[PDB]
């Protein structure tokens, strides 16, 4: 039984920074994602049951960890603004609750992050994390479905973790986690298919066709709607995930810096590939602001090759 | 602070809303372990299988059910004053992603037939959190799992399916299996809609009947399994998903008819494992679907 | 068969033992949170939340017209109900900021009466592990609180108290108050016996008890010079850990031999001596001052 | 701010030039093995009944597992185990002694009971052996505790002070609730199991008759008696409402019952680390002391300083 603790600590230590600032950081967000997965179960029963808004308290949970942790000194959370700037090195970026649209309905909904260090000559700005998506040290999600997940990269592979709830512990059950080269599984919001552009609109009727390297079968489609969950089923089954630009988003929804970047990263290392609606790699991208927006092709390697060949 | 428990005293049987609801937690607590109910020991079978178990196992132990239909029996269970039907999880394609899953059950006073002829019906949502929605004739309440007290408590009552919302919620890779007047109502819904701002319907679709209905009940919306050239009659079992469900839906306010626009509970099955094809939710949008046709 | 609480009740009014029990897991989780209760917040005094949260819920029944609370002076009397119940919520208070064990017991009557008259009696037992030990007049039976289902489950049906076991449980820090009766029988139970007894004490009287019930022996508070009329309450400690002593084949006397249960308070907390236990060495004990 | 066992442990370690993450892996292995024991604890009776669709025998179980999982945990004694265990395939740093779950007797009842552990850094260079533990007391690097009562608490020492933790059943996390925990001078508890009066000589015998006694250190009232039945949880009392516990040789226990290395040691140190004070039956000091077998037995008095002196005061003149 390995515990997402003792895996942390055995791979620092193979940098000689087994109590470094990193194990620090991975402390914070783990202990975060407990506890939101913790707030999000018990759903209506935060307003309802006392002691005798819940993305907002996500994101209040996960700024109060992260600050304890001590070491991060820059966070961007997606309700704020501004960079958010701690008193006393790493930068955090992160969707505390990515999916929000359907906390209501008691489905499955996430927390996205990546993690980048400060740059040499730096005491926490914007310039820490306004940068090419290649330099994140690590990223990782939760997804809070019929049970809690935490899917991480540090660099060499990705790892999935099952949060044991009798012993709230992220417990290892997906090691080197490859995502399939082929698998005829779609995943978007058809409802924007007027917004579409042809190129976008071609691509989503040739998935629906017979497929020869699916039996004659054309794809099967799936969108639960939260984007962590949605890109989680893809990493474990396999298929392709989009949010596509349209008229009414010319630059997508996903947000580079904390989600197109960390599922970009973690595809890339599960084996999958990810590039926006022209083709470009999305770790190849630079945000100019830091809620900046991307489009977002991902998931089985041989699907993306299909998008890209459609694209030419 | 009402308790399902107390709901149940205070309406009034209760020994199978009880049995049922001890098997909803059991199940909900079984799913949220995943695969740590292969690794994990105390210091290797399959998550459908244990959950028909349980649900088998708490059935058989109320000793007031004498009949049981579970989709995973071909044959039908014996084991005294009614019967049950229950899909014990719904949705195990996705199971291994750990999304939302759910059960569902319909209850019959004694044996199996007309859908009119339901005494209650629920499911229990699995998702982010633990939902069970009930009907016992007259309307629906929701409740939610408190693991704190291992209690289901009151949250939803009176639910009611708001008359107009655009979602659906269908599988379009089917598309390639449907019949023009099914492809053509899809094709509708991806237009401007005068009702929603000049806007299109928004698509949703978890691939687990249970969650995508709780999400029409709690927003609004259409869910659809129509019939298609693999599935002729459709994917849902009328016994038990598509019976309690309609039911379910009528008590909220909503419509719920086969492609050919026949009311679900008019319905009577010819064996315990025939299919339905299905359209329920929103009243209003269930009605363009009946223009449509 | 599992067999839970509710199952139980409906197989055997229905509405009071639910409250209780639901009542009892919402305290049961509430101690097991200890210091976080003032310290964790929704985003990052026990005994005073354990009385609003049993008040609450036996409000909330509607079935209960009267209430006797330890923690609440006088009467306490709701708008909207057949039955009375008198409580200790949290019993053992000065072990909480220990950790140790602790417990709810409570009484129920239909309708300051004789003990004979109770409806029915039980504790809950906030340990290691959460027990229920009930009564409704036919023998005893205990549950223990399954935590991944928050049901109590039947861990001990038809309990029965040995009549006979080597363990006394007392505060001999009183011995200076006590009169010479008392202070030999104590001496007595240190000697040699066709080893002398072994001595348990958690004080919490609930888990003292708990224990007597499972694994036989003795346990007392008698009247002391500084209690003169014992420290249970006769009403609601007393009185049901009578009931459920009788009931499981024990005995339940005061320091001069009376049977609890035909006793009559006077005022809503009175207080009375006991002593209880295996019926062998409650005949002991009887010999002794008798 | 909320502090985490984990961030505490590591906010520590990384004061140190040689530390390696060795030592946080201990201390993760056994809140990992606290965490599971307190769990399979709460399920009492319903790990035999409930299944999928004996609790010493699993907590040893567990125990092993998880310090055998650790990687870097060479030498272990576990009081069920009556022979010396050694994990070649680990790392060669840290030896652990423990009683994975003390107080058997009182399972049935679902009371208090508690894990107790010492940790001893290896002797240089060693492939892990039993010179590896028998040594003095002194010799320890860490101590800690696990009370499983009505909640679940974890007190530790790394040899400066004690502190203790809280378990967060919502999150599975040790919050610390009771920093640089120190143990009252003076107070008037007092436990012991008095039914072994008999077996006990005369200068025990005396000394628990005059705590019985008023004291006009305690406004001319007798100290009051309290004795669980389980060591962790009647020692957990006296570290946080002061008092005395003990546990004498008497004759059928001519060398006590506590075992020195993995419960009179760690208790031992946690007591002098939280301002109190640890002896045997003849006044002297529990840690000064060396087991010649990894069980040996040790008699223990232990709690506030000035109930300890006290008993030193009377065992002197008794002589
Ligand atoms: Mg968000
Ligand atoms: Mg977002
Ligand atoms: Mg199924
Ligand atoms: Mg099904
Ligand atoms: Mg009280
Ligand atoms: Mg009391
Ligand atoms: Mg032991
Ligand atoms: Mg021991």
Redesign the pocket.
């Known amino acids: 039984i390995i515990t997402l603790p003792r895996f942390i600590i055995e791979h620092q230590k193979q940098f000689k920074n087994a109590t470094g600032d990193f194990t620090l950081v991975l402390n914070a967000l783990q202990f975060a994602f407990k506890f939101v997965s913790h707030t999000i179960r018990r759903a209506e029963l935060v307003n309802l049951v006392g002691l005798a808004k819940l993305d907002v308290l996500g994101d209040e949970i996960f700024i109060n960890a992260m600050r304890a942790s001590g070491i991060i000194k820059v966070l961007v959370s ?1 309700e704020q603004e501004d960079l958010i700037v701690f008193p006393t090195s790493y930068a955090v970026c992160c ?1 505390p609750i ?1 999916g929000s649209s359907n906390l209501d309905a008691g489905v499955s909904v996430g927390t ?1 992050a990546s993690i980048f260090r400060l740059l040499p000559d730096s005491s926490g700005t914007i310039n820490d994390v306004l940068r090419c998506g290649k330099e994140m040290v690590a990223a990782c999600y939760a997804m809070y479905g019929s049970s809690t997940h935490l899917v991480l990269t540090l660099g060499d592979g990705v790892d999935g973790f099952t949060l044991d709830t009798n012993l709230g512990e992220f417990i290892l059950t997906h090691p080197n986690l490859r995502i399939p080269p082929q698998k005829a599984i779609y995943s978007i919001n058809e409802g924007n298919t007027l917004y579409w552009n042809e190129t976008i609109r071609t691509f989503i009727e040739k998935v629906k066709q017979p497929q020869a390297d699916n039996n004659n079968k054309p794809f099967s489609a799936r969108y639960v709607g939260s ?1 962590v969950a949605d890109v989680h089923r893809t990493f474990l089954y396999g298929g392709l995930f989009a949010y596509p630009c349209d008229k009414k988003s010319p630059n997508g929804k ?2 580079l810096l904390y ?1 197109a970047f960390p599922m970009a990263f973690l595809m890339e290392q599960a084996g999958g590939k990810a590039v926006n609606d022209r083709g470009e790699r999305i770790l190849d991208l630079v945000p100019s602001h830091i809620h900046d927006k991307s489009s977002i092709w991902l998931g089985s390697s041989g699907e993306i090759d299909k998008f890209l060949d459609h694209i030419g």
């Open positions: 997606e969707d990515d996205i984007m996903l947000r989600e």
